[PDB]
C-alpha cells in the first residue's frame, strides 16, 4: 500500500432513521500517532477533555 493525503472527512447528514443527527467523521491511517488524533478532537472538533 501507498501513502496519500485523505479525501474522506467532514460531516455526515444521516437521512432517514427517525431523528436527524449530524455526525462528524475523518478517514485516518491505522498507524497514526494518537497525539495527533487527540489534537484533532480537542481543537478541530471543539470537544473538551
Amino acid at each position: 500500500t501507498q501513502l496519500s493525503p485523505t479525501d474522506a472527512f467532514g460531516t455526515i447528514e444521516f437521512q432517514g432513521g427517525g431523528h436527524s443527527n449530524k455526525a462528524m467523521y475523518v478517514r485516518v491511517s491505522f498507524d497514526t500517532k494518537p497525539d495527533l488524533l487527540l489534537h484533532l478532537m480537542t481543537k478541530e472538533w471543539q470537544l473538551e477533555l
Binding site: 474522506a8 472527512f9 432517514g16 467523521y25 478517514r27 491505522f30
Partner: protein, 97 residues
C-alpha cells in the same frame, strides 16, 4: 453497538443532552464508501442496509467517527490497535483536578 444506538434513541427522545459517543470502525467495511468522499463537505448517508451485502452501515446516531483504513475492505482488525493506543493516550493525560 446496535444496542448502544437504541439506547441513544431513547436518550434523544426524552433527555436534552448530547452524549459524546465516538465510534471507531474499519473504513473498508462500511456500506456506501463512495457516499462519504469529500473534504469538509456535508455528505448525506442512507440508514438503509441491504441484507444481501456483507458490509454493514454505520450507526445512525453516533456523534463522531474515527473510521480507520488499513487498506483492506470487508475485513476487521484495522481499528483494534488504533483504539487501544488512543485510549492509553487519553488516560496518560491529566484530569482537570
Amino acid at each position: 453497538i446496535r444496542h448502544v444506538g437504541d439506547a441513544l434513541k431513547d436518550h434523544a427522545s426524552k433527555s436534552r443532552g448530547k452524549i459524546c459517543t465516538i465510534g471507531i470502525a474499519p473504513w473498508g467495511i462500511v456500506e456506501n464508501q463512495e457516499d462519504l468522499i469529500g473534504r469538509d463537505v456535508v455528505r448525506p448517508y442512507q440508514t438503509m442496509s441491504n441484507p444481501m451485502s456483507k458490509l454493514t452501515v454505520l450507526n445512525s446516531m453516533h456523534s463522531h467517527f474515527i473510521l480507520a483504513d488499513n487498506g483492506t475492505t470487508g475485513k476487521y482488525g484495522a481499528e483494534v490497535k488504533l483504539r487501544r493506543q488512543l485510549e492509553k493516550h487519553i488516560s496518560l493525560q491529566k484530569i482537570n483536578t
